[PDB]
Amino acid sequence: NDYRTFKLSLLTLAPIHIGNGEKYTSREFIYENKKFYFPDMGKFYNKMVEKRLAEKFEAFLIQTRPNARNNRLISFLNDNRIAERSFGGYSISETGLESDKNPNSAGAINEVNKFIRDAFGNPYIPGSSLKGAIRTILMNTTPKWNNENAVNDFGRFPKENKNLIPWGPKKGKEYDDLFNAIRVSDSKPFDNKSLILVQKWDYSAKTNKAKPLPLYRESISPLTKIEFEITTTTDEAGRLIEELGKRAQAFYKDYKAFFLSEFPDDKIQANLQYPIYLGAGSGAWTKTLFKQADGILQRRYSRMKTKMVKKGVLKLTKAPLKTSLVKNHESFYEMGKANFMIKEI
Amino acid sequence: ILTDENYVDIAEKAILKLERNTRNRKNPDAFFLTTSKLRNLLSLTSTLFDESKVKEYDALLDRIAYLRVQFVYQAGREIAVKDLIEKAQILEALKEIKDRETLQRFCRYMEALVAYFKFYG
Amino acid sequence: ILTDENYVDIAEKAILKLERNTRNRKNPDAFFLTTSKLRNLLSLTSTLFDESKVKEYDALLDRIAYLRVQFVYQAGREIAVKDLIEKAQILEALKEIKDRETLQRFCRYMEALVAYFKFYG
Amino acid sequence: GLGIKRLAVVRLDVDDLGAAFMAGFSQQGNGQYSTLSRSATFSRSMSLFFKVYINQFASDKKLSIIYAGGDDVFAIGSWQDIIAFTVELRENFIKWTNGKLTLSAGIGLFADKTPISLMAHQTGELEEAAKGNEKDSISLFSSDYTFKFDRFITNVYDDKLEQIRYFFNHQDERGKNFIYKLIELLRNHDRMNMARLAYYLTRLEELTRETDRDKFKTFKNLFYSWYTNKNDKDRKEAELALLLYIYEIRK
Amino acid sequence: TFAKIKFSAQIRLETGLHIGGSDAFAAIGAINSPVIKDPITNLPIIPGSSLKGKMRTLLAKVYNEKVAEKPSDDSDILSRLFGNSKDKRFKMGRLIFRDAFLSNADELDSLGVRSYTEVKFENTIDRITAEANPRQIERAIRNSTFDFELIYEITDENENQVEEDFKVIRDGLKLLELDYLGGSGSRGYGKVAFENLKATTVFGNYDVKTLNELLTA
RNA sequence: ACGGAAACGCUUUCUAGCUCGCUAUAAUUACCCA
RNA sequence: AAUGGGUAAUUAUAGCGAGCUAGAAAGC
Secondary structure (H helix, E strand, O other), X not given: OOOEEEEEEEEOOOOOOOOOOOEEOOOOOEEOOOEEEEEOHHHHHHHHOOOOOHHHHHHHHOOOOOOHHHOOOOOXXXXXXXXXXXXXXXXXXXXXXXXXXXXXXXXXXXXXXXXXXXXXXXXXXXXXXHHHHHHXXXXXXXXXXXXXXXXXXXXXXOOOXXXXXXXXXXXXXXXXXXXXXXXXXXXXXXXXXXXXOEEEEEEOOOOOOOOEEEEEXXXXXOXXXXXXXXXXXXXXXXXXXXXXXXXXXXXXXXXXXXXXXXXXXXXXXXXXXXXXXXXXXXOHHHOOOOOOOOOOOOOOOOOOOOOXXXXXXXXXXXXXXXXXXXXXXXXXXXXXXXXXXXXXO | OOOOOOHHHHOOXXXXXXXXXXXXXXXXXXXXXXXXXXXXXXXXHHHHHHHHHHXXXXXXXXXHHHHHHHHHHHHOOOOOHHHHHHHOOHHHHOOOOOOHHHHHHHHHHHHHHHHHHHOOO | OOOOOXXXXXXXXXXXXXXXXXXXXXXXXXXXXXXXXXXXXXXXHHHHHOOOOOOOOOOOHHHHHHHHXXXXXXXXXXXXXXXXXXXXXXXXXXXXXXXXXXXXXXXXXXXXXHHHHHHOO | OOOOXXXXXXXXXXXXXXXXXXXXXXXXXXXXOOOHHHHHXXXXXXXXXXXXXXXXXXXXXXXXXXXXXXXXXXXXXXXXXXXXHHHHHHHHHXXXXXXXXXXOOEEEEEOOOOOOHHHHHHHXXXXXXXXXOOOOOEEEOOOOOEEOHHHHHHHHHHHHHHHHHHHHHOOOOOOHHHHHHHHHHHHHOOHHHHHHXXXXXXXXXXXXXXXXXXXXXXXXXXXXXXXXXXXXXXXXXXXXXXXXXXXXXXX | OOEEEEOOEEEEEEOOOOOXXXXXXXXXXXOOEOXXXXXXXXXXXXXXHHHHHHHHXXXXXXXXXXXXXXXXXXXXXXXXXXXXXXXXXXXXXXXXXXXXXXXXXXXXXXXXXXXXXXXXXXXXXXXXXXXOOOOEEEEEOOOOXXXXXXXXXXXXXXXXXXXXOHHHHHHHHOOOOOOOOOOOOOOOOOXXXXXXXXXXXXXXXXXXXXXXXXXXX
């Protein structure tokens, strides 16, 4: 049998958020215990119309109100005593380090991007996430695929060639399709209460400051293990998954000297296993070709939100401590630095 | 109100009717509305548009009743979406949800709004 | 405009009039518009054209304006499809849908468009 | 086993042998050649062709000349030999009669063991429909296949049928389904079917293998020539050429 | 004689399968790649055609001694199971692969599932300039079951080849859990199991008890 | 005391056989606005 | 200097669009 399986297991050193697009907006959650609550807002509104105060709910949602402790629907659910908490939904715990210098604001957060959940309500990590993470590593750590992933003289710094890797039918040849031999399966649905909603924390270059951002994506609680089935059937992609144990550390080493140097290593994590970068907020250099997008990636941002000079601003988070994996105080983690080990089974 | 033959044109002559950036005169007559602030409008509707086909409308009416408050809320957060919902009468169309076919018709009307906004600028 | 006999030549020199790969002469006289930016449009007209022979005209008139939604939308994404609907008078011929017969005739015109688009390279 | 179990029946007719006999040579001259000796010699020449020489043109070919002579030939037989016998009969009749007195044959296909006065009637119907076409015509397998003989043997049976045969002999992807769809696109043929055929040939153009690919490219270039030829003189010809090829390769 | 036996299996999904849906009148910011669907109830079902075409290549990776280059060139251990288009006595294929229907609608309403599909955002991150290109490819939910029927023939032309092709068929049943039933493949989308095998002769006189040894073992 | 009386263009035949809606694709990027 | 707030972008891209076999036979 020429199907050479593997098994990738992924410890979570960092907050790890992935996917699902949709979110719970500013006036769309409940913080009355130390647990955040997200019910079904349609179910909540349809049960609240039996309380008949829903017209005030029309004025509550457009209410531009300072001192935002009364903005985030706890005031709607304590000022008018609707505190049933029977709305269909899922509760999660709080971070604790969620807001900086905001006493009694453990609930005045605004936007929580959802983690990816299936129809059961139990969150998992899909194999498309790990395969997109794998493709940047296996693209940067092979020198034949790093030369002409560029303009193609088609537009204004448009896109990749997408032709350095064999792709498609290719009518007249054999079956090439190299990345089809890396069948990154989806993870098993783990526990619901491993989510923390970490804040994005920008650490500026040429400005020793830790200016945070008002977007608290639901990430994964640290130090949790994840299963991944990965099978191989072609020998070249099989050798690529065999050489992952060199290519991961090689990409992280050449990415450290390209990006992570000049920045202080107190907030930067330690590896302790095979390091990798997963999705949603780890910087574009972990999602692209780092020695190919020097002036090409940052050329698009000519807006109100331009990347400082050349290269992205360092992104950190804030999440509590177990075991350390932080290597400093005030709990600045790294938002996507995961660990893996691999073994053919 | 909108029916099967007019709802594109309802979203046609409304889009030429909205105001634009009279000031900020670099590439002028650009929309105060931005594309993300209209995808935040459509992404509420487009999930119910496909939930309507599997389920039934009498097992669905609660989410459109809350979607009323969602269009109010997104209107309550900007000077353009407060303008959009009445210069293109989305809040008028939201009162008539009478069956699942009219619900899907309203969702296609929202899609027509997004399409005709993407057609200009 | 589109009648019963004149539409094939219309689609012919609406494929000819479209501008091609002038810069970067690597197999030149090739369309900037991609064939998958035409087949994703004609997969609407085909699911009209073969479900028109089963049904009335006045049962189909929900999807008929949705054609005018999607043609406006896919014209708004790439500049090539906006160029296409400027050369090929698609949105001006979607007003000319009054019955089953002219709808099937317009779908034959769309098939002539894709046929002559595949014909030239 | 290639060929269809048919039997074709040709009924020729010399086009106005009454007018070629009564007036005939009197068109030429001032009545200098309006004599009796020339008419007797001409009718003895028609007797010597249609009453002796048909046993020379039918010699190797497998058929039965049931009736011949005067201005009629009713010859039953097998359809390849019947078509080749009509080909050789007119292509040596216009050598015999200098191209004057074009003959108007009508050839119908008939299945095995179908009666003959049922068959002679249809052959005569195709014969008179070929008669009224112009001065002369062949009528092949039905009155809508009505060509001049000068268009039939040169274009179909010399040019088109050999290109069609050689194109399908020296390849083995495009079998009979492609020929059937080409016949149907040749037969329906509104304005939109030219677009459908321009899609069909181009979609098959990049589907053939790279070795024998430019054979298909020059054949679709040579096929879209006569299909969109805007004349309808080069279209029913090609449909009949494909029908003759299909009947020649019937399993 | 002439008998006809039935192979019933339950395709239990793990991270289920997107088999490209029908309607092109899709969306703007919703599903733009649906799953195939039983149009009276809009249930995602598994058609037998994807099963036959998956098992064709999955068993041609094993039982072909010759390279294929085409169909109608299989090694005649498959060409009596999946049929040839060219071989004179093997135009038929004696295997009927009925379309698997989603069965456990009752237990999956006890599980808190809104509707029996999902919308899985699966964008294309541009490898330079980092821009996104989203797709919403719809799949069946993670733990649905499907009634994979199957029907096999027995004539007066199958003396011992009834049991010759069973370990060829069971090779397909335990290599379908090596591959992905159609979909995108390399993003999961096909890992399945085949629960509750109950093989019996729905027509004709053939034994069921000595038949029941090699199926599940 | 009608070239007329009597006369089913009729009997048999699966639009069938073969065919994965497939191939590539981290819902992500950027840092802010009064 | 605090606090109030998310803002802008892409919404599927590139293809394949049907391929061969049979194209009426056998009797009345």
